[PDB]
């Protein structure tokens, strides 16, 4: 699930 995403990352890979 990876809930602890990097806040700076862009989900729109």
């Amino acid at each position, epitope marked *: *699930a*990876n809930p*602890n995403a990097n*806040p*700076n990352a862009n*989900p*729109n890979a």
Partner: antibody
Framework: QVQLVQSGSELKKPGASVKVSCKTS????????MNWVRQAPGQGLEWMGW????????TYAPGFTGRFVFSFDTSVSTAYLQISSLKAEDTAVYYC????????????WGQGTLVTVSS | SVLTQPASVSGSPGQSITISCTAT?????????VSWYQHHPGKAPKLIIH???KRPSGASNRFSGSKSGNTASLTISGLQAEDEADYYC??????????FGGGTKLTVLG
């Protein structure tokens, strides 16, 4: 300036179809995800899902799988929400909203589109 | 609702008020990706806090956010009439999924 401008109010019979547009400007459309959020009468905001504007992959939350389609047209930097087989309980204001990052979701919102489904 | 907020809070002008937001499941993980939105009915919601406490310069400095355990909290100081609105918290829950709390109607007793 970032702008999300949605289409106008819709009035539909049950079983009909509707397509809501969310035109963007002020940023590169394919750089950021476009999310959709609903507010039914007397209820709160509900996250519906999103579409990746690079891959086209749509993600639908539980509750919005089966009859909902997120799409986009990059030729006009526009995202779309289409609903098939409309039901009375689809009545709601529908918003598009950009996600900038995981840290900053829903930084810019459309003005909302009222969709009324009544027999 | 994955995030529990009080249905309503009231305060009088000039006071400070706090709106809580508690995670109902462990899907929030670290619970560090919490955002808040001000919503005047009829207009679009507005982002006012992200990553628990980060306030964009375009929001009023009377709004602040904090967290303790699994309860995120929005505080509005120097309450004014224009603050009357619905407020929603929001959290990432993994798997590229987001959820909104149920919302809080803030009444400003003016």
């Amino acid at each position: 300036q970032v702008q999300l401008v949605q289409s106008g109010s819709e009035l539909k019979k049950p079983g009909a179809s509707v397509k809501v547009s969310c035109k963007t400007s002020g940023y590169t459309f394919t750089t950021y995800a476009m999310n959709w959020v609903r507010q039914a009468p007397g209820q709160g905001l509900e996250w519906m899902g999103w579409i990746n504007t690079n891959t086209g992959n749509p993600t639908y939350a539980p509750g919005f799988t089966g009859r909902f389609v997120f799409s986009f047209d990059t030729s006009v930097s526009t995202a779309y929400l289409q609903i098939s087989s409309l039901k009375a309980e689809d009545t709601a204001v529908y918003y598009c909203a950009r996600v900038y990052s995981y840290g900053v979701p829903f930084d810019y919102w459309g003005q909302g589109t009222l969709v009324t489904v009544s027999s | 609702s994955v995030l529990t907020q009080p249905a309503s809070v009231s305060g009088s002008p000039g006071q400070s008020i706090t709106i809580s937001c508690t995670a109902t499941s462990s899907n929030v993980g670290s619970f560090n990706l919490v955002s808040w939105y001000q919503h005047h009915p009829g207009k679009a919601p507005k982002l006012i806090i992200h990553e628990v406490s980060k306030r964009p310069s375009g929001a009023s400095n009377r709004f602040s956010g904090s967290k303790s355990g699994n309860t995120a909290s929005l505080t509005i100081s120097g309450l004014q009439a224009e603050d009357e609105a619905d407020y929603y918290c929001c959290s990432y829950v993994g798997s590229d999924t987001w959820v909104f709390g149920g919302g809080t109607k803030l009444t400003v007793l003016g």
